[PDB]
Ligand binder design. Sequence first.
Ligand SMILES: Nc1ncnc2c1ncn2[C@@H]1O[C@H](COP(=O)(O)OP(=O)(O)NP(=O)(O)O)[C@@H](O)[C@H]1O
Ligand SMILES: [Mg+2]
Length: 293
Amino acid sequence: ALLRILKETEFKKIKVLGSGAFTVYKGLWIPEGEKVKIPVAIKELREATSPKANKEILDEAYVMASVDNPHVCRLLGICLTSTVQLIMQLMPFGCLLDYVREHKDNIGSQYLLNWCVQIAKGMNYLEDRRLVHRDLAARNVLVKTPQHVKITDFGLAKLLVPIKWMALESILHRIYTHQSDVWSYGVTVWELMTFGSKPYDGIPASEISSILEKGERLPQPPICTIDVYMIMRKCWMIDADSRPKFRELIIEFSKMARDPQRYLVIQGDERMHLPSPTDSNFYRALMDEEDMD
Ligand SMILES: Nc1ncnc2c1ncn2[C@@H]1O[C@H](COP(=O)(O)OP(=O)(O)NP(=O)(O)O)[C@@H](O)[C@H]1O
Ligand SMILES: [Mg+2]
């Protein structure tokens, strides 16, 4: 019941928001018998085969329609035609990568650390459900409000290549576990703490696996103390079961979000605080009524 099969005639694509490797549209759901048009997000993929890619897509979409977590985007509906179209809640703020990139001069420690906690809470839920993201990145974290981030694009990757966000065991042997997701998680934290820098900028993807084996890792971002950089460093250990668990990651960034400036050194950090409750409640009443935003 968590996945609504839609007819083509009851939703319309309107404007393109972006496109990657799996095209995302700002669209309009028209419920039958009504005069309202309800904004939705529509992701359309490449070609598809009826004699095959139907249940394979539909059965795995039911999995994606079952994720129930404040920090993981749920698939709401599907339309199975020549193409494949997935309908989800439109998030008007866009991805966290472009967000922190357009707001470099305005992301405090309280936000950054809280975003880590939220991403780890999302990722930790997927593990409790025995599910592997396969494509975690700052571009796959959506901004519902600036105070509430949600992971997106779960289970896309498996049903359909981001070398610079994959663990070595995944580049070399195509092994994808919850511990490989932790690697990608660590890279995402690096994108966030650099305000959106490209990982291994300029280095060809072909050569990433070698530099990992000789022990290149992403550099400690300026604003990071070694406590945070150590945590990052531990995500990219060669031995996957030496990497932190998502559940450990929640507790630690939570600890650090309780004294933000001791762990991140941002200029004027004292003036870029979280919203007052008043602002927070107004935000939620219009944009984010979710049970535990
Ligand atoms: N539900 C959504 N609401 C609003 N914007 C969205 C939504 N889903 C995706 N987008 C944006 O649409 C664009 C395309 O996303 P997508 O096609 O998944 O490529 P990508 O995230 O940039 N990289 P990848 O997912 O790894 O292939 C990105 O700029 C996303 O932030
Ligand atoms: Mg995406």
